Amino acid sequence: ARYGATSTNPAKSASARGSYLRVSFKNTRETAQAINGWELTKAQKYLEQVLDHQRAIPFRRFNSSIGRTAQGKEFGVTKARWPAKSVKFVQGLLQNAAANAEAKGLDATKLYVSHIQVNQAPKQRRRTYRAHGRINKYESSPSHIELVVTEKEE
Amino acid sequence: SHRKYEAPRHGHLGFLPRKRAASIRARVKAFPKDDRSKPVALTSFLGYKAGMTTIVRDLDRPGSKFHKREVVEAVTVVDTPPVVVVGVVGYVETPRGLRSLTTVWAEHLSDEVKRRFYKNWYKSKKKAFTKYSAKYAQDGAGIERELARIKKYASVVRVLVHTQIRKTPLAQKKAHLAEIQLNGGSISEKVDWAREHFEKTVAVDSVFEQNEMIDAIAVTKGHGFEGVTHRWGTKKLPRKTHRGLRKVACIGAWHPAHVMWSVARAGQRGYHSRTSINHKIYRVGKGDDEANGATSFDRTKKTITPMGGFVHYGEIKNDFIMVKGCIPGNRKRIVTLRKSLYTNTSRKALEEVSLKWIDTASKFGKGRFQTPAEKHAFMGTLKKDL
RNA sequence: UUGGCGGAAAGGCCUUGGGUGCUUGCUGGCGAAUUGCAAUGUCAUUUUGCGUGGGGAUAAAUCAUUUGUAUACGACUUAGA
RNA sequence: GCGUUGGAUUGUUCACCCACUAAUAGGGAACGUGAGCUGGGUUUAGACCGUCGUGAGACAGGUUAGUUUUACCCUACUGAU
RNA sequence: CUAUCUAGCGAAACCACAGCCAAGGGAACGGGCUUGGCAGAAUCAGCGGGGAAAGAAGACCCUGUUGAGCUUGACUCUAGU
RNA sequence: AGAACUGGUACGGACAAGGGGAAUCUGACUGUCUAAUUAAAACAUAGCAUUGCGAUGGUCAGAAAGUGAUGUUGACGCAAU
RNA sequence: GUGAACAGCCUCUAGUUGAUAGAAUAAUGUAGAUAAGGGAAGUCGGCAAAAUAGAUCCGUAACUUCGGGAUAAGGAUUGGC
RNA sequence: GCCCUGAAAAUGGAUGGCGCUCAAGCGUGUUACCUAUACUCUACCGUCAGGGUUGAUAUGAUGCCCUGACGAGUAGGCAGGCGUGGAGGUCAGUGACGAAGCCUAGACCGUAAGGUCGGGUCGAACGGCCUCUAGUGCAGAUCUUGGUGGUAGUAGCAAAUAUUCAAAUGAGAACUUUGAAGACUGAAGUGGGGAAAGGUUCCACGUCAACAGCAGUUGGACGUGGGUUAGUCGAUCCUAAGA
RNA sequence: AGAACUGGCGAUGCGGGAUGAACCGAACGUAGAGUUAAGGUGCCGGAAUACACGCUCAUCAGACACCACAAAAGGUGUUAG
RNA sequence: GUCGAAUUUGGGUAUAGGGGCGAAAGACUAAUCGAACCAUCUAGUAGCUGGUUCCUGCCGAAGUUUCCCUCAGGAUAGCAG
RNA sequence: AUAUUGGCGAGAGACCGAUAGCGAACAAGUACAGUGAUGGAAAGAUGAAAAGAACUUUGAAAAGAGAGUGAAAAAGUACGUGAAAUUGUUGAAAGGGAAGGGCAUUUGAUCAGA
Ligand SMILES: [K+]
Ligand SMILES: [K+]
Ligand SMILES: [Mg+2]
Ligand SMILES: [Mg+2]
Ligand SMILES: [Mg+2]
Ligand SMILES: [Mg+2]
Ligand SMILES: [Mg+2]
Ligand SMILES: [Mg+2]
Ligand SMILES: [Mg+2]
Ligand SMILES: [Mg+2]
Ligand SMILES: [Mg+2]
Ligand SMILES: [Mg+2]
Ligand SMILES: [Mg+2]
Ligand SMILES: [Mg+2]
Ligand SMILES: [Mg+2]
Ligand SMILES: [Mg+2]
Ligand SMILES: [Mg+2]
Ligand SMILES: [Mg+2]
Ligand SMILES: [Mg+2]
Ligand SMILES: [Mg+2]
Ligand SMILES: [Mg+2]
Ligand SMILES: [Mg+2]
Ligand SMILES: [Mg+2]
Ligand SMILES: [Mg+2]
Ligand SMILES: [Mg+2]
Ligand SMILES: [Mg+2]
Ligand SMILES: [Mg+2]
Ligand SMILES: [Mg+2]
Ligand SMILES: [Mg+2]
Ligand SMILES: [Mg+2]
Ligand SMILES: [Mg+2]
């Protein structure tokens, strides 16, 4: 309960979330922003294509010195990637939201991703060993992911 | 302090930037100055670099220690199929430079030139110029008025011509379209020349002649990212050098506190547009003319195509221009040959070559035989055949 | 509406003929008010969307595969109903 | 504007000589340039000699050995979208 | 084999704010100030001119009425003899 | 050990495995040290020379001892250079 | 087994197949090499690299503490049957 | 007098720039004009000074009012005030019908320190006034503790020749098991054992939240258990340097 | 580098000298109006491309003190003596 | 480089901080050596560096005299509240 | 009669209130480090009561969406409240080699006062 700021009808909306998921926060944010606002089935097809390496997730914020690819032209970017782990997590949350929408009795053909946000979970801490007997952090950046799918109206 | 030992600069600053050319076809940035008394003729031609070979010819150079005896010279052979005239472009003089007033194309365009106007030909609907072809419905009233505007205006007239690349062994299959300036007086006749020549082919015999000095404009062979040592010829650092020795040691003084444009730095080498001048044509041979590679002294029935074909290009079956030395660009690459921009009279030009022998041995190795007939005559009978 | 001229950024200029409206060139009749003593007292041009009608035509590019005249990756050059 | 060298000795700058050359002009750019190099010298710690000092030690006195670290940031430049 | 790209993983140095120049003056070498030149999103790979780059409260020099190692008929003592 | 024949005169056919000579300065040599910048000509060495001492002693320990090392020793020894 | 050999290389018993991987093959690197002619002209300095290398036979200087120098130097041969 | 020669330095650049030639240059004269936190007047704030006013209801004579002048400021001094923890008195002060706290480009008051209110969140205490008291105010101290960034999804995860196919298990297999192939350690081993050390890592079962810098169904991980059998092997006995 | 008197900066803002601690003017509570100081009135830039008498043409003209430089010596350049 | 005797090394043992040990480098003595590590005296002293926490109002300096083992400090007189 | 930072038993405070107060409010001289002498932390709070989420559905599962308990789940044992740095989503605005600021006004948004 108590998702992020949403401006859609809870009666026409269905939500899903995953917390403390050990997946890169930056990659998951880019994956979520790639499908934010999309139709449910179109977003699922796009995520399957990304997993197949047929389309790519455009990296807009966490993209410094990552690399260039030709699949970013449709998104007006040169920097896109294929964050398979984030795509799988978001696909799991999308199918969870589809199940909840079906349970509530929403039109699956009118479902679009009305809201999706990824934020930083508490970091899981490990240690790495560095020259001259030094110890540095090796922390992961897990994600809390949430999304709400709503029936499109006029 | 000073350099303490003077040395000429590494590299030429007039060839900057050392970036990739914007197109695989080098632009002709200058055409011969128009002399309004000569007949209307093309000032350039479009061909493809096939490869190199060697010839023997008597050197006609009075005053030389080695006059009137035989020299072996490298020559580059460029396949030059006739270009089809498919358009006409007029340029009027403006205080801001030359400006294209209008362009009048031919009625019917081959798929070869139409392919240039598409990136995906296989899935296209080939609608190009279909409404333009309707401009010739009954009399081409719009067309003749458009040509009349070119005559009333447009102090410079260029024809739009494209290569017949399906006649070359290239798998490209897409023609190269270029504008060639029409030199010769009576601009009205230039449009008359172009209009009459719509859908018509122009052969290399009408542009180039034997012994003529022509200009080679082509995009050089690309070599990707290159270090300073080979990109500019800078001195290799000693073997003792830490962090590598294929570098430039000092890239700048403390002040100005910036790397200067004149310092050799690593980057892309090659694939640059070059215009190399004063290359002499030694042959204007004809594709239909069997025994292309023969001379008045050999008479052996052999074409210009080397035994086994030009390496990486194939067999030459069209008109070809043989130039002395080498030209920018690699094999299979589109090249444009233009007239010399001045009248060169130095006894290197105006010197009339007559070939004595043309090398037709295989470029695929240490070729021993000019013709398959000679190979059989030498080795005799083999077990496989012959 | 007729014809001509203008390519330097022409996109405008000149002209034949008729139609309609005004005509303060001159002489008349009618109306104004209350915006209350002034309040720019809203009259111009610049895009965009939308609805109603009429006119007009019925593609490409990118990804993916491939090529290698190219190339770190992009990019470039290709080919494929 | 365009060139202004190859070498013997010496860490050397400088100097001198051999030789070619058209010429072997003089300089700056934090006495340009060590996250460009090298470390021959100077300029740590080891060691020898001469002089000085009673001595520990001193020497623009000589000699030998002696770790040259980091760029992935911004800009600049070279290329590339 | 890297470097490059991708899947997964994933730090550190450093960080007044930050980042285009020329000249002027200025704490006498500016990224900011003044006068000019200029100046168009977002970027990738190299690179080592600059950030008087980073690493260390300069180890060279000086001061301190701060030491310490060592030496000598410095001063004052002392084990032993 | 020898001979004949044989071969793209190859044959320690891969592996394996001294470069050599003429000298100069310096330390005799073998050996030892600054672990983590100095392996050296530095230290050590046999050799040479000097000094002290016959035990109620020389040299050196212990705060002191009915305490010790040399000494389970004796000048061809121990101790200090 | 080859080989003087616990040298190097390969194999039998036994054990392992464990180091994050995939795709291309730019620059600059790390490691390994080659290079026509010249042969230290590079450099402080032959640094680094190359050259020599096993075995049999011939031959082997100055000097010397007569013990060495010495594998001096310089040469010839090497397989299979 | 003006101008020219004398008059050569290094990034491209400076009457400030543009530019200016009976000047927009130089010498000189006459006016008009522009504007400083300066000057004149006025308004308001504060400070200082001189006064008026207990003839009352007049509760603020530290009060009210009149008049004149002034106001820069580091080190520094003094004065008047704001705020915090706690304390005595008082407001028979506020509050579960919501105290404190926190958020609030919402409003008001004060020059300011700050104060007050509206809304949201929240849940148990708290405040105005007179006065007392101090462990009483932070932007720095390469300040301390803790947390968090850009760097940055970047550097990188490159020594030890090397892995490949199929099946099984499993939600999921480059990494687990089995089989096949190809290799390596090549007996001074990547083999078989032991001493020091470790202490259950040995083995079985179930099992993957964390670790195995990828992954994982596997493990020297996790949870539960099982396992070390001596007259002859050692300690134990003896003595060595020594204590 | 060191003294004397005074004024300033330090401690000080403002207008001007583009830019500047010291120079010129003027010292500062919050504002309005007016006039000015020094400095300026081609544009940047508010203010006369004002008036008047003359001088100067520079193939490195010249352009407001502090101040950001120029000299001796020359010129039938030109002007006045 | 050395590799059969001044060899390498396991275990036990002895030498402990102004002490040991040192084929000697001020070398080693548990990543610590020109005097190890731990705790305490100790919150050691520092004329030296850094920091020093709310507002407003009023006034408002000095780098000068003399003395000091004094010249980075203090006292004194002066300036100021 | 005088001393008493130790032991035992008490009564108190203008003392501190979990980075404070003893190092230790808690399995604190504990975990852990060092060969050793010694060094030595961090760490309190759901809710009145677990009433700690029965059950349905999606997923292999962790969990999610419903349902439910509860005064409150804006209290879910990662729990009284829940700031800032920093981050995501949505909304609004600006942006030619910084940004932030002052005077004055335009414009947009919002708002008290009679
Ligand atoms: K001393
Ligand atoms: K010392
Ligand atoms: Mg970048
Ligand atoms: Mg490491
Ligand atoms: Mg370590
Ligand atoms: Mg020079
Ligand atoms: Mg070349
Ligand atoms: Mg090196
Ligand atoms: Mg060939
Ligand atoms: Mg220098
Ligand atoms: Mg440098
Ligand atoms: Mg360096
Ligand atoms: Mg040296
Ligand atoms: Mg002496
Ligand atoms: Mg990178
Ligand atoms: Mg500058
Ligand atoms: Mg200067
Ligand atoms: Mg700076
Ligand atoms: Mg500016
Ligand atoms: Mg670099
Ligand atoms: Mg730099
Ligand atoms: Mg210092
Ligand atoms: Mg220091
Ligand atoms: Mg003193
Ligand atoms: Mg003292
Ligand atoms: Mg002392
Ligand atoms: Mg020796
Ligand atoms: Mg020996
Ligand atoms: Mg050493
Ligand atoms: Mg060494
Ligand atoms: Mg044998």
Ligand SMILES: [Mg+2]
């Ligand atoms: Mg060679």
Ligand SMILES: [Mg+2]
């Ligand atoms: Mg050779």
Ligand SMILES: [Mg+2]
């Ligand atoms: Mg030779």
Ligand SMILES: [Mg+2]
């Ligand atoms: Mg030399």
Ligand SMILES: [Mg+2]
């Ligand atoms: Mg040399």
Ligand SMILES: [Mg+2]
């Ligand atoms: Mg060598």
Ligand SMILES: [Mg+2]
């Ligand atoms: Mg020999």
Ligand SMILES: [Mg+2]
């Ligand atoms: Mg010899």
Ligand SMILES: [Mg+2]
């Ligand atoms: Mg002059």
Ligand SMILES: [Mg+2]
């Ligand atoms: Mg002016």
Ligand SMILES: [Mg+2]
């Ligand atoms: Mg004047």
Ligand SMILES: [Mg+2]
């Ligand atoms: Mg005023």
Ligand SMILES: [Mg+2]
């Ligand atoms: Mg004041």
Ligand SMILES: [Mg+2]
């Ligand atoms: Mg208190």
Ligand SMILES: [Mg+2]
């Ligand atoms: Mg409340």
Ligand SMILES: [Mg+2]
């Ligand atoms: Mg706020």
